[PDB]
Amino acid sequence: PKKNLVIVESPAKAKTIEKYLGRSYKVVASVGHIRDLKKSSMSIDFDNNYEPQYINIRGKGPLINSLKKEAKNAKQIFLASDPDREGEAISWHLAHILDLDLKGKNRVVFNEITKDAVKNAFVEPRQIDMDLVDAQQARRVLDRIVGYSISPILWKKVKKGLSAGRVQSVALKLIIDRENEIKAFKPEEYWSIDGFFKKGNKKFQANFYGLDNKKTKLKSNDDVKKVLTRIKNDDFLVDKVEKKERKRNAPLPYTTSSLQQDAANKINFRTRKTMMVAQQLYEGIRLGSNGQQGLITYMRTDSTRISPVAQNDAANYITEHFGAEYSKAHEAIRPSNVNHTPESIAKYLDKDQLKLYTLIWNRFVASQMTAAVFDTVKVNLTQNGVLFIANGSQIKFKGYMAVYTKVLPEMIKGETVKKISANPEQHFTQPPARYSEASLIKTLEENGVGRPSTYAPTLETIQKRYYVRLVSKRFEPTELGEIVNSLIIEFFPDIVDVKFTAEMESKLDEVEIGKEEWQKVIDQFYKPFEKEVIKAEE
Ligand SMILES: [Mg+2]
Ligand SMILES: [Mg+2]
Ligand SMILES: [Mg+2]
Ligand SMILES: [Mg+2]
Ligand SMILES: [Mg+2]
Ligand SMILES: [Mg+2]
């Protein structure tokens, strides 16, 4: 009786998958990477087109030996690593250590850890995708060449122990450019006027807009006076009434970027914690006697697609719980089972897992719902050329907002309302906001620089390196970060450059699809970079 071997990256994953598979399957964790570049040397074969020189990781020897013994005992080997570039290179390193044939169909991929998703994966296993593997290799070779080339230069000109990276340097320069804008900003005093009116004895508020049919900027207390003195009596003509219905569509389901943004904005999660907790949700949590189950789809994704089956089950949850009026190869981040309401499984989750799951559940359900609808009214109240604007809003259909506004007294053109009081208020303009974790992520996504694997580590290493601090939830450059940024701008300008770095990520994308040869991406980077390293070592 010889079993099937299934290798996974973590024990929590193996425990979860173990129940799903049954007798003729043995499930073991490799506990992270087992092969890596050498730590004590560059570990790139520059005579053989940048081929990485890998070793078995220092310390993992005994683990590796036991994997080899289990593989000998096994009937067939299945590599069940996560479905991304990194998971494919893990599977390739295991193939290498276990002497498996790369033409064999030993790779099984799934994007949630549920009994149904797991078993469908073994129905059609595939061979290892060497394009995905080469895309991981390229990133690893790039980051190694950059890190081990620049770091000694920082040690020479700044301080021992320093390091830099590609996307980390882009982010740091973006933060320093924003700080330069802040320093150069010139605040200005300006004033507003709140008005309080009545139609009948129904009170409401309208804000000063301007004089003589233009918007008016009030720069001082004297400008407020000039408005005030134009106001003779309390009578205001309803010069116009505007009405509309406003449709607020539903957000898309979470990607890695939008999950990280929402978690940081809404529940004060640092991005590292968001990914840590998502991983717990994903790899499997004990739901009591029903044992461990994966509660969300895989959390590293840039897809917003929902699968047909997942779509149908949510429509049914929505139709049944709100009304059918609220409905309509990778995937977004969603509950694996929508019927696992946050309320139901609350008792099985710690507080942090409860928050992130609640966030992911709400967002995915909302995203499967219909638009909210509002009833707008804009009302112009004019006297003697002075214009106040009243605004009113109420919801005509909650729509997706089901999972989570004042109205105006009635008016038509020509009626009259009475002015009770006006409240001038002093303000000062503010500079552009600092990057929060949210807006940094959003910026890195929109400008083409970030990817699901690189969002959280970039914001981690920039803080581990002490190049920025994070106060009142926004990044500020440190003095050391300014020093390092200036050196790299001086000697390696392209690695702070947004466009060159988004270009590189797109070339990595092409490697993944087999459109470009990974060694060529490295060579087009390395040939110019090499010259800059020589000149910086002068
Ligand atoms: Mg070894
Ligand atoms: Mg990668
Ligand atoms: Mg990178
Ligand atoms: Mg590396
Ligand atoms: Mg800044
Ligand atoms: Mg991550």
Q: Can you spell out the DSSP letters for 306-328?
A: --HHHHHHHHHHHHHHT-GGG--
Centroid of ligand 4 to alpha carbon of 145 (angstroms): 8
Note residues around ion ligand 6 (Cβ under 5 angstroms). Answer: 275, 456
Produce one character per residue of 209-247: b if its CB has 16 or more CB atoms within 10 Å, e if not: bbbeeeebebeeeebbeebeeebeeeebebeebeeeeee
Can you list the alpha helix ranges (DSSP code H) found in 10-129? 11-21, 61-73, 85-97, 115-123
Task: Report the C-alpha gap between 350 and 378 in whole angstroms.
Answer: 47
Q: Which of 298, 400, 435, 467 is catalytic?
A: 298
Query: What's phi and psi for 299, nearest 5 deg?
Result: -90, 0
Environment class of 79 (CB within 10 Å of its CB; exposed 0-12, middle 13-18, buried 19+): buried
Give the pair of three-digit tokens for residue 146.
């950059």
Q: What is the 3-state secondary structure (H, E, C) of 366-396?
A: HHCCCCEEEEEEEEEEEECCEEEEEEEEEEE
Centroid of ligand 4 to alpha carbon of 142 (angstroms): 7
- Please check whether residue 129 is in contact with residue 90, taking contact to mean a CB–CB distance below 8 angstroms: no
Task: Report the C-alpha gap between 75 and 7 in whole angstroms.
Answer: 13
Q: Which of 340, 333, 337 is closest to 364 using CA atoms?
A: 333
Amino acid at the residue 438: A
Produce one character per residue of 420-446: b if its CB has 16 or more CB atoms within 10 Å, e if not: eebebeeeeeeeeebbbbbbbbbbbbe
Task: Report the C-alpha gap between 332 and 535 in whole angstroms.
Answer: 46
DSSP 108: -
Centroid of ligand 4 to alpha carbon of 70 (angstroms): 30
250: helix, strand or coil: coil
- Please check whether residue 304 is in contact with residue 36, taking contact to mean a CB–CB distance below 8 angstroms: no
Give the pair of three-digit tokens for residue 196.
């309080």
Task: Report the C-alpha gap between 91 and 79 in whole angstroms.
Answer: 6
Task: Report the C-alpha gap between 225 and 191 in whole angstroms.
Answer: 11
Give the pair of three-digit tokens for residue 308.
């047909």
Task: Report the C-alpha gap between 84 and 89 in whole angstroms.
Answer: 9
403: helix, strand or coil: helix
- Measured CA distances, 108 to 82, 123, 434, 511, 528 (Å): 9, 9, 43, 21, 40
Give the pair of three-digit tokens for residue 377.
């009214």
Which residues partner with 528 through β-bridges? none
Task: Report the C-alpha gap between 475 and 462 in whole angstroms.
Answer: 10
Centroid of ligand 4 to alpha carbon of 37 (angstroms): 7
Q: Which of 27, 17, 26, 29 is closest to 119 using CA atoms?
A: 17
Q: Which H or E run includes 524?
A: helix 518-537
Task: Report the C-alpha gap between 106 and 128 in whole angstroms.
Answer: 7
Question: How many residues make up the chain in this entry?
Answer: 538
DSSP 296: B
Q: Which H or E run includes 54?
A: strand 54-56
- Measured CA distances, 318 to 290, 328, 362, 365 (Å): 25, 10, 12, 8
Ligand nearest to C-alpha 146: 4
Q: Which H or E run includes 468?
A: strand 468-471
- Please check whether residue 227 is in contact with residue 216, taking contact to mean a CB–CB distance below 8 angstroms: yes
- Please check whether residue 305 is in contact with residue 368, taking contact to mean a CB–CB distance below 8 angstroms: no
What's this structure's resolution in Å? 2.1
- Please check whether residue 269 is in contact with residue 285, taking contact to mean a CB–CB distance below 8 angstroms: no
Q: How many CB atoms lie within 10 A of CB 267?
A: 14
Centroid of ligand 1 to alpha carbon of 100 (angstroms): 17
Task: Report the C-alpha gap between 25 and 13 in whole angstroms.
Answer: 14
Centroid of ligand 5 to alpha carbon of 435 (angstroms): 6
- Measured CA distances, 72 to 18, 40, 65, 151, 529 (Å): 20, 33, 11, 43, 45
Q: Which of 35, 43, 89 is closest to 67 using CA atoms?
A: 35
Q: How many CA atoms lie within 13 A of 430 on its CB side?
A: 4
Active site (annotated) includes residue 400: no
- Please check whether residue 9 is in contact with residue 29, taking contact to mean a CB–CB distance below 8 angstroms: yes
- Please check whether residue 136 is in contact with residue 85, taking contact to mean a CB–CB distance below 8 angstroms: yes
Task: Report the C-alpha gap between 206 and 419 in whole angstroms.
Answer: 10
Task: Report the C-alpha gap between 442 and 421 in whole angstroms.
Answer: 43
Task: Report the C-alpha gap between 322 and 317 in whole angstroms.
Answer: 8
Produce one character per residue of 500-519: b if its CB has 16 or more CB atoms within 10 Å, e if not: ebbbbbebbebbbeeebebb
Can you list the alpha helix ranges (DSSP code H) found in 418-492? 437-446, 455-464, 479-491
Task: Report the C-alpha gap between 259 and 275 in whole angstroms.
Answer: 9
Give the pair of three-digit tokens for residue 109.
């991929």
- Please check whether residue 536 is in contact with residue 491, taking contact to mean a CB–CB distance below 8 angstroms: yes
Ligand nearest to C-alpha 169: 3
Produce one character per residue of 350-382: b if its CB has 16 or more CB atoms within 10 Å, e if not: eebbbbbbbbbbbbbbbbbbbebebbebebbbb
Interaxial angle between packed helices 61-73 and 85-97, expressed in degrees from 0 to 180 and rounded to the nearest 10: 70
Experimental approach was: X-ray
Task: Report the C-alpha gap between 59 and 190 in whole angstroms.
Answer: 65
Give the pair of three-digit tokens for residue 376.
């707008």
Task: Report the C-alpha gap between 387 and 239 in whole angstroms.
Answer: 9
Give the pair of three-digit tokens for residue 444.
């890195």
Domains in the chain, CATH or no CATH each: 1-134 (3.40.50.140), 135-183+432-538 (1.10.460.10), 184-249+371-431 (no CATH), 250-370 (1.10.290.10)
Environment class of 414 (CB within 10 Å of its CB; exposed 0-12, middle 13-18, buried 19+): exposed
- The DSSP line for 180-216 is HHHHH----EEEEEEEEEEETTEEEEEEEEEETTS--
Give the pair of three-digit tokens for residue 270.
């640092």
469: helix, strand or coil: strand
Can you list the alpha helix ranges (DSSP code H) found in 158-293? 166-184, 221-230, 256-267, 271-283
Pairing of strands 51-52, 54-56: unpaired
Centroid of ligand 4 to alpha carbon of 461 (angstroms): 14
Task: Report the C-alpha gap between 244 and 206 in whole angstroms.
Answer: 18
Centroid of ligand 2 to alpha carbon of 503 (angstroms): 15
Residues of the chain with a following break (C to N over 2.5 Å): 328, 404
- Measured CA distances, 353 to 258, 275, 336, 481 (Å): 17, 11, 15, 34
Environment class of 534 (CB within 10 Å of its CB; exposed 0-12, middle 13-18, buried 19+): exposed
Q: How many CB atoms lie within 10 A of CB 409?
A: 18
Which residues partner with 199 through β-bridges? 202
Centroid of ligand 5 to alpha carbon of 175 (angstroms): 4
